[PDB]
Amino acid sequence: QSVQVFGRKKTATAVAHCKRGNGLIKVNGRPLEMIEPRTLQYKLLEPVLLLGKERFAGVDIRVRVKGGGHVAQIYAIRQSISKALVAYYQKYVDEASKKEIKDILIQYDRTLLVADPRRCESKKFGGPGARARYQKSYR
Amino acid sequence: HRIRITLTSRNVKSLEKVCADLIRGAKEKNLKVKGPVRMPTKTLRITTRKTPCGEGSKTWDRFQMRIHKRLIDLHSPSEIVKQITSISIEPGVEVEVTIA
Amino acid sequence: PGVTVKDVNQQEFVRALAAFLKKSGKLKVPEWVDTVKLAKHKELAPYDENWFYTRAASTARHLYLRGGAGVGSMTKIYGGRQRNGVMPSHFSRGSKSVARRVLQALEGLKMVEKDQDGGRKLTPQGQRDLDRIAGQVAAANKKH
Amino acid sequence: LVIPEKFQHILRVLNTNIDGRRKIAFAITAIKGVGRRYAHVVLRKADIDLTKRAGELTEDEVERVITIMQNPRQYKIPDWFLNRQKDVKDGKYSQVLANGLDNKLREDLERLKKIRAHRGLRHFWGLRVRGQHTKTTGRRGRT
Amino acid sequence: DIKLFGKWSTDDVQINDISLQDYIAVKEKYAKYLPHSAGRYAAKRFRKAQCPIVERLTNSMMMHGRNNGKKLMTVRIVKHAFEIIHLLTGENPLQVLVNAIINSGPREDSTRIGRAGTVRRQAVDVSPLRRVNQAIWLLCTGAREAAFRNIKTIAECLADELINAAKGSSNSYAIKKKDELERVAKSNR
Amino acid sequence: DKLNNLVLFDKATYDKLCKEVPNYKLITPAVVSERLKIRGSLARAALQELLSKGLIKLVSKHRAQVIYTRNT
Amino acid sequence: GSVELYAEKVATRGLCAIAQAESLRYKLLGGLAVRRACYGVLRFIMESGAKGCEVVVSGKLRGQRAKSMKFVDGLMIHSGD
Amino acid sequence: PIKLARVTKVLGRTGSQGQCTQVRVEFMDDTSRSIIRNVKGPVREGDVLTLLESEREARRL
Amino acid sequence: GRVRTKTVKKAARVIIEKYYTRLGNDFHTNKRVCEEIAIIPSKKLRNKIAGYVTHLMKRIQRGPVRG
RNA sequence: AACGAGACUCUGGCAUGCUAACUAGUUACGCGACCGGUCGGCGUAACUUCUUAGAGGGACAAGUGGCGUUCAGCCACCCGAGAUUGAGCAAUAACAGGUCUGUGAUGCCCUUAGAUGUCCGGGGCUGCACGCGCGCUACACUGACUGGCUCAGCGUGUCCUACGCCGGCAGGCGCGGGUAACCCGUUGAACCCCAUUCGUGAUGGGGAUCGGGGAUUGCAAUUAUU
């Protein structure tokens, strides 16, 4: 049937739902081609270009994205799709193609399956930010 | 008919003990309950200059208080409602009851 | 099969919907369009002489996307940055008279009906008119 | 990509010179009293294209520009758009221009110098007017 | 295969120096689609050497205070700078970039040794990693100085900087500053 | 010194545009501007009618940068 | 009639800091020497089962110049939660 | 001419502020000869240096 | 730097000299035998004792230790 | 042996394992709109992936390979969410360090009825030849202008405000919600991004300065409140 898997950059959280389909990839009910920042278009295209159009042929993935910024949200989609296809296999096909896809993805990029744990450090008094301090006056 | 019990405290240990006691008592009698739902914690922040005279190196105290909330829902008459609450009494816990 | 406005581009669709409204003549244009700015955080008047048609198209698209708005809610949409001299820049808002008389010169089209628990929404005919133009934009994309 | 036949490098509008290679929506802004929002609304009401260089204008077009410019009221220009709206001495809504704009500032200062207002004495002494902090800034001109 | 921006291949690029061959990451596992990976190469030592050289070029161009986070503008600057060189030279812009990196790095330098006052500098060697880093620095510095107040768009002054360096020409900021730098170090032999 | 650029085409500059430019391999508003000593707007406007006539091929188009080449 | 006040006894008086910081105040206010007033408080604190005690007295004890006398006994922690 | 030498081991850090590194380098041609050199920048074993003047041997900085 | 302290080293030495029979080479089992016996506060302090125990049991196979 | 260091508390990163949800949602199914698709259009049932917050786990230089008087430890690597996250607290002994202008903390000295108490009216604290420190805006094309498209988190609220009408706007009138995961608010933020115009120039960069109007807060805006 279906699986629901999330991807997560700084504060953005994309959730991809996959079921039996015919090759539809859509984020927010919108085509993957026209996600607003076209400069980072290939990051969204990396999983399907690496694996191939024939693996997303019996699967229908719909993504809902919320939080964070534009660049973080784009990075939260390429991870969500990759994780959801890995989760769709090893549950509906076998434990043999999940390994193949997981390897192919993780040699190219580890952030396609593992989330970056970095988050903003809190501001500290006595400076504009976490580390920067105010200019010190002598005489 | 619907009975909403709202619990609010600052000590989560005491508040959770009270909530567990209330839920267990309602299970003990023949009642149907809606489980404890936790509202987001309320964090109140006061930041103050440490010095009383504005002389030193401009250090600041960061003060804060935390308020914990729960909600429980029952379907029972008020006669049945007003036994378990009277059994369990704990300081710092603000129990409130609303009939629909 | 068919399309919606979500299946096509938006910067080209607004340019194409704004031309469908300009060729019917039912849209009623205020007397002050040649003089007024669109917000208080803008230094010049809009470059396009037909800004009212483009803004009407953009408001129609926003109403299609999210159902229900108002004059101030449709003024938050077209807000931006105001550069305050030697003081830091700040978020600023648009003009409510424009936000309200683009939302009124769309009831003369029978294309926007007042929302029940709020402001404005889209009519079935208004949904039709946007889908039938998304169709032409998609055809232009496919055949080229 | 155009090669107009008649094209003047420097034209004369309202006792001041204007570059013909400059663009019309910003060329007339050169003459005093006109900014970047009054110079555009005058051109819209005169129905003159803004894409042309100032040189690419016939005699009638330039003569019309001054006509709508100097009489904004007759061509449905709102009253809040001028540079002296409710005048002190006669109370008329008029747009003053290059030779008149500076002929109605000296009168404004002479009013407050003859009638010894505080701000007219500030303008007289050369100090500042809008209630500023003169302790630190403004040390140019002063020796 | 996986080619930069979808149209510039990598398998045809050859690194000349054996010295900088392992400090330039262009060919097999570094063949990416974009100079954008959200990498963490600045966590341990010598990790930056695994960063793709095109992405290394991209970062150093978002310099001076007004550009410190505008990476998407630099991705299109590099994208347009690669499609211009190929129109002039007709070669692979990746090969042109590699040849510029090789040419514009100093191979000998000078280090302060005398006590404060009179300058008694010596002559020392240069690490391959520092040579790559400083080639990138010089190439990016010459691109933005030549474009600061010109009609010439950037990504056209970067292309001209990269062309003149892959030829080892004296019409190049990086070559000019590399020659002046090894000149002084020879004087201090 | 000052950089005085022609705002409008005369005979010599127009002929040099029509003949010399279409073989540059690097038709570009920033290039044609220094070649013909004309303003960045006149060259920019003149490079679209060359495309309309079919004499040059468009390579790249964007806000910050537009890039043309020769025919064939 | 809503509010009612009740009075009760502290279980152990020697381990309450306030009851000892007020007991020592009524000995310095009644003519005891400071050195003997402070040892009489430390002794009662330790004999009641405390693990450690510290008593500090500050002010003009000798003339027009102030100074501090500190009396410690046992263990005393200073840092952490 | 230009020689190429391969770093075999890192000895220590020299310079007024520790900005240079002692290395012993082995030549590619006539590999039997190994000499002491000073470098500038991050160096690890296996790095190959390009020596322009290949006669000097290093000393403390 | 990752250097233990006299508290953890003393506690681990005592545990080893008192319960040699049950302790072994596995960390995750020594982590569970320490919680059963010694009254230790939180996991971070529990683990640093049960890690030095596992480290210090390997040395015993090499021969005796002076502690 | 003890204090200090460490430990400790709060916080960030992980759990498709547990306990839960109409003041959070998702999936499915109906009704509906439009051309199988889209719907933050409307209503039911599957539950907790997403949201919220409680419990318990989880990381210890633990495993491997080197170095180390083979100890204490250091370097690299695999696996792994993570192989140093950031703060709070903080010793003995001192300083003629700041605070009598925070206090019904306080000793002396001064004054106390044409007052050094207290209230009322109007001024000053900001004045300006000149020096000395924190800063905010810039010196532009890696830009400005004009349109279009598209994303947060921490907080406040019985002053925060949705909706409708007149206004270019600043701003005004009538009904509504919220003592709040219930309403502003699915917080449609700005840089970012996509098209246009400008074209190296004290220029459409940059905004100081100053003149006319208009509107708000207040008893009062004149030494311009905003």
- DSSP per-residue letters across D36-48: SSHHHHHHHHTT-
Check: CB of residue B14 under 8 Å from CB of residue B20: no
- Choose among F25, F67, F69: nearest Cβ to E80: F67
**Could you identify the residue written with the tokens 């020596």?**
H51
Bridge partners, I22 (sequence order): none
Give, in order, the Cα–Cα distances in Å from D131 to each of D111, D127, D128, E160: 20, 10, 7, 55
CB atoms within 10 A of CB B90: 14
- Other C-beta atoms lying within 10 Å of the C-beta of residue E101: 28
CA E93 to chain centre: 13
D105 CA: nearest nucleotide by C1': J211
Q: What tokens were used for F46?
A: 């003149």
Q: What is the DSSP string of B19-75?
A: HHHHHHHHHHTT--EEEEEEPPPEEEEEEEES-SSS-SS--EEEEEEEEEEEEEEEE
Q: Can you give the residue range of the structural domain that contains H44?
A: 1-61
Q: E87 by DSSP, 3-state: which?
A: helix
Closest CA to I33 of I44, I45, I46, I42: I46
Nearest to E45 by CA among H18, H23, H42: H42
User: For chain C, what is the domain count?
Assistant: 1
Buried b (16+ CB within 10 A) or exposed e, B33-69: beebeeeeeeeeeeeeeeeeeeeeeeeeeeeeeeebb
Angstrom CA distances, B23 to B17, B34, B78, B84, B96, stand at 10, 9, 16, 9, 15
Alpha-carbon span B85 to G29, nearest angstrom: 51
What are φ and ψ of residue H43, in 5° steps?
-130, 135
End-to-end CA distance of chain E: 49
User: E178 exposed, middle or buried (CB, 10 Å; 0-12, 13-18, 19+)?
Assistant: buried
Beta-sheet pairing, E108-112 with E121-125 = antiparallel
Give me B35's structure tokens. Answer: 């489980």
Calculate ∠ Cα C5-C6-C9, nearest 5°.
75
Q: Indicate the Cα dihedral angle G7, G13, G17, G21, nearest 10°.
A: 90
DSSP SS3 for D65: helix
Q: Which letter does DSSP use for residue D23 in this model?
A: B
| Strand J: positions under 7 A of a protein C-beta atom | 2-9, 12-14, 16, 19-21, 23, 26-28, 33-41, 49-55, 57-63, 71-74, 76-77, 81-82, 84-94, 96-99, 101-102, 126-138, 140-143, 145-156, 161-171, 181, 185-186, 188-202, 204, 207-214, 222-225
Show the CA angle centred on residue E137, arms to residues E132 and E141, nearest 5°: 150
> With 0-12 CB in 10 A as exposed, 13-18 as middle and 19+ as buried, what is D130?
exposed
Dist CA B10 CA B17 (whole Å): 13
To one decimal, the resolution in angstroms is: 2.9
Give the C-alpha separation, G26 to G35, whole Å.
14
The phi and psi torsions of G23 (rounded to 5 degrees) equal: -65, -40
CA separation for the pair H1, B35 (Å, rounded): 84
**What is the b/e burial string over D1-27, where b = at least 16 CB atoms within 10 angstroms of the residue's CB?**
eeeeeebeeebebbeeebbbbbbbbeb
Burial, A63: exposed, middle or buried (Cβ in 10 Å; 0-12, 13-18, 19+)? buried
Query: DSSP 3-state assignment of D128?
Result: coil
Rounded (10°) CA dihedral E62, E67, E73, E77: -40
How many CB atoms are located within 10 Å of the residue F30 CB?
21
User: Are residues D112 and D65 part of one domain?
Assistant: no
Angle between helices A97-108 and A70-88 (to 10 degrees): 160
Interface of H with E in 13-52 (CB under 8 A): 15-16, 19-20, 37-44, 47-52
Place of tokens 């020409």: E169
DSSP-assigned letter for residue A30: E
- The values of phi and psi at residue B7, to 5°, are -115, 140
Q: What is the C-alpha separation between E27 and A99, in angstroms, rounded?
A: 26
Distance CA C107, CA C122 (A): 10
CATH architecture, domain F3-72 = Orthogonal Bundle (1.10)
CA distance E106 to E125: 9
**String of DSSP letters for C23-61:** TT--SPPPTTTTT--SBTT-SS--S-TTHHHHHHHHHHH
C1 touches strand J (CB under 7 A): yes
Look at residues C55, C66, C65 and name the one whose alpha carbon lies nearest to residue C130.
C65
- Give the residue numbers spanning the domain of C144: 1-144
Sign of CA dihedral E74, E75, E78, E83: negative
Between CA E89 and CA D9 the distance in angstroms is 42
The tokens 């700084």 sit on which residue?
A: A10
Pick from D40, D76, D78: which is nearest to C45 by CB?
D40
CB of D4 within 7 Å of some strand J atom: no
Q: A46: burial class by Cβ within 10 Å (0-12, 13-18, 19+)?
A: buried
What are the two backbone dihedrals, phi and then psi, of residue C28, each rounded to the nearest 5 degrees? -105, 125
Q: Are E125 and E110 in contact (CB under 8 A)?
A: no
What's the CA–C1' distance between G81 and J88, in Å? 9
Task: Residue C7: name the closest of C135, C140, C143, C144 by CA.
Answer: C135
Domain interval for residue D64:
1-78
Number of domains in chain H: 1
Q: E26 and E53 in contact (C-beta within 8 Å)? A: yes
How far is residue I49's CA from residue E2's CA, in Å, rounded to a whole number? 51
Q: Which residues does E119 contact at the CB level (< 8 Å), separation at least 6?
A: E112
The amino acid present at B80, given as its one-letter code, is I
**3-state DSSP call for residue D138?**
coil
Q: What is the largest CA-CA distance in chain G?
A: 54
Which phi and psi (to 5°) does residue D84 adopt?
Answer: -140, 100
> Residue F8: its chain D contacts at CB < 8 A?
2-4, 7, 21, 53
* B and H touch per CB criterion (3+ pairs under 8 A): no
Query: Phi first, then psi: what are they for E135, rounded to 5°?
Result: -60, -45
Asked if residues D69 and D27 have their Cβ atoms less than 8 Å apart, the reply is no
Nucleotide with the nearest C1' to D26 CA: J204
Whether the Cβ atoms of residue I53 and residue I45 lie closer than 8 Å to each other? no
A123/A125 Cα distance (integer angstroms) = 7
Distance, CA of D112 to CA of D132 (rounded, Å): 19
Q: How far apart are CA C114 and CA C107, in angstroms?
A: 9
A123 contact to strand J (CB, 7 A limit): no
Q: Which residues contact E171 (CB under 8 A, 6 or more apart)?
A: E164
CA distances from E165 to A84, D47, E27, E100 (A): 47, 55, 21, 5
Question: Closest Cα partner for E186 from E124, E105, E114, E104?
Answer: E124
Question: Would you call D35 helix, strand, or coil by DSSP?
Answer: coil
- Ramachandran angles phi, psi of F20, nearest 5°: -75, -40
- Tokens encoding G56: 């500090």
Domain total for chain I?
A: 1
Phi, psi of A96 (to 5 degrees): -135, -35
Query: How many CB atoms are located within 10 Å of the residue E159 CB?
Result: 24
D97 with D29, same domain: the answer is no
Look up residue F25 and give its two tokens: 């391999």
Domain ranges of chain A: 1-139
Q: Which has the closest alpha carbon to E97: E153, E49, E62, E135?
A: E135
Per DSSP, chain H holds a count of helices (H) and strands (E) of 0, 4
**Residue D49 per-residue DSSP state:** -
- Closest to E34 measured CA to CA, from E70, E71, E89: E71
Strand H34-40 versus strand H20-27 pairing type: antiparallel
Tokens of F68: 């043309």
Are E37 and A109 in contact, with CB atoms under 8 Å apart? yes
Domain that holds residue I29: 1-61
CB of A112 closer than 8 Å to CB of A5: no
Q: Which residues contact C119 (CB under 8 A, 6 or more apart)?
A: C68, C69, C70, C71, C73, C103
Residue spans per domain, chain E = 1-189
Residue H46: burial class (beta carbons within 10 Å; 0-12, 13-18, 19+):
exposed
Q: H56–E113: do the CB atoms touch at under 8 Å?
A: no
Write out the two tokens for A6: 């999330």
Same domain for D60 and D9, yes or no, is yes
Residue E5, sorted as left (phi over 0), alpha (psi -120 to 50) or beta, turns out to be: left
Hey, where are the domains in chain B? 1-100
Alpha-carbon distance of A15 to A34, in angstroms, equals 18
Asked which of D63, D78, D93 is the last residue of a domain, the reply is: D78
Q: Which of H10, D9, C122, B12 is nearest to E45 (CA)?
A: H10
User: Are D11 and D74 members of one domain?
Assistant: yes
**HSE-up of H58 (CA within 13 Å, CB side)?**
23
Residues 6+ apart with CB under 8 A from E164: E171, E172, E175
Residues 6+ apart with CB under 8 A from B68: B8, B9, B10, B12, B15, B38, B41, B42
D117 and D60, same structural domain? no
C46 touches strand J (CB under 7 A): yes
Alpha helices in G9-67 (DSSP H): 17-23, 25-28, 34-47
Q: Which amino acid is at D132?
A: Q
Beta bridge partners of residue B8, listed in sequence order: B69
Residues D76, D80, D86, D87, CA torsion sign = negative
Picking from C92, C95, C7, the residue whose alpha carbon sits closest to that of residue C55 is C95
Instruction: Tell me the C-alpha to C-alpha distance, in Å, between residue E122 and each of E26, E119, H17, H34.
Output: 35, 10, 14, 21
